[PDB]
Amino acid sequence: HAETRIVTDAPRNSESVGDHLFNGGVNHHDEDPDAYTKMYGPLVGYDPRNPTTLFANAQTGTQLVAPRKAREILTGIYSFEPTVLAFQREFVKRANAVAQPDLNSDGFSLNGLHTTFDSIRSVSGYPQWPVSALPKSNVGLLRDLKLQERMTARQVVIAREIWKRVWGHMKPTAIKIPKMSTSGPPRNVNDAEMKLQYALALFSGNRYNGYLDAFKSGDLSRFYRDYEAAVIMGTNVRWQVDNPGKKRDYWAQADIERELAPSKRPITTKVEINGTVYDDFAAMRTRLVNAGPWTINVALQPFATGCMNAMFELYRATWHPDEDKIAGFLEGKHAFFGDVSSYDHSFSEEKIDLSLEVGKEFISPEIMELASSLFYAAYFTRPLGPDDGPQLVGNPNRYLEKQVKAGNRSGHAFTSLFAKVWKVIDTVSKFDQMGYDVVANMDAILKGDMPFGCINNGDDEIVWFKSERDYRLFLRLLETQPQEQRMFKVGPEEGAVFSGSVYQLIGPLKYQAVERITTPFQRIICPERSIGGNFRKFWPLGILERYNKRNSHPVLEEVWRVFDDTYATLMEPHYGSFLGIVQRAHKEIPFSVDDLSWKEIMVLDDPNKMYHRFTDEEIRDQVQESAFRKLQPIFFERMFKEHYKGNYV
Ligand SMILES: [Mg+2]
Known part of the structure; x- marks a missing residue:
């Protein structure tokens, strides 16, 4: 067949997906163009007069994006209980007494501890409100961050050279289909079987071409009707422990319609649990995250993962070094550990656009414009604070025009790739400001065969120098860099x-890796999410791994001593033994703490690390399958043959 539509005229829900499960061998949608249409139901229908109904069958209408609700931190222990809060008080005070952060002027810890334990007096499930919204423009942030108005000529050349190498090489790799997260609109279900069947549809017949024709027409009704696609972001929230004494502000929902780049209001949330003020405790910091619909991202992810896998191979020393060897690598080398403020949101419009422009050299233009559509899409959010209502920001009916300019948009197939590449572009520009010809020596820099380089994980980087004069001029360059x-x-x-x-x-120039000593106790005592449920099915492993290496560092060992003793006195009599709780749950999960590598345990705690930190080669299938379905490269080879002009690695 040669059908161009994913949704044909066939009667919907006339077949059942249970009768056409994918066997890894043949794409049934090749044999039957009406299959996707038949196995899923009719969509509600898109009314351009009220686009928010895209999210109607999903958490609905008025429930807050970040509700105040106590976490189950351990089996039978809930975060709003006084006993827990009293435990946190005493633990933090005891841990502070046993260890204080010993930092030098360069910013290195000489004892391993980099901060106090005060942040562990945070109440999980009790959010700072309002969750800060996303303004329609970020130019006020660029101006507040005293950043450039545009890139210099040389920086545009450097960016073109690096993106030439990234877009220009692809190592075809399986599309990863997430099991536990939403598809977003229109179906708004957490159904990886549907996401996979949709993918088989898009990559069968002439559907990808048909998808793009519909996309570029600008006829949202047609794109929705025939491909169950709309260019719009939904909204989520991520929670984390806050740092004492940072400036806590937010963009109000009421301000973001009044001007493009409104100023920020102060968060004033206090912790009061049924009329009892905890003046020494912090509410959880909340950050807005967008999430792209599967039916938009599935068309972009092959390139995303293909380009990144090739990038890890061709330029391993920059983008995928053996993490366990980093310390040994930096021995005798000077090192700058960079810290970036509002990295992703601070990406200029020019930078996003340049990225996609260079991509058109190697990838069909319509695919890059689709990517451009999602980067700049409208978004719908449920209330961000208790006084707000639901809100659509931007006009998704005009999706071919830019609606929201928010830099490296969260929820985009390209988000991690962009994070990774632009940080290197930035740093390599600095290498060029130092008087080296980075264009001539670009591959050697990126492969790590020059006297200096950078080790990247998105906004997190190490800039290293064999020479002390290079190192010092680099630091000078940063202190004196003009806007x-x-x-x-x-x-x-x-x-x-x-x-x-x-x-x-x-x-002297000798480094030793230690996991942030606060992390273990933050993750136990002040978790983002309750144990179990959706995202924390494997929770005993992360704890036991950490507990089993407690003796590996002197400060870590003493803090764990204070955790155990304090838990024994203040918690155990109410809730039972710590290890009792952790081991009983340990015995329920399919993997032992000893079955798994540290990398596999990280993936089980955060599956999205499969999209940016670990490769298929490092994580066993049984672990990956806990969070993902996959579609192997052969199933979208045809698409690549038509739409990719780069090199296969
Ligand atoms: Mg860092």
């Missing part, structure tokens, strides 16, 4: 942390 050179607001990172571990300065 027109300033791509991102970068400063040195207190504690010198990279990918979760403090790089302890144990001797």
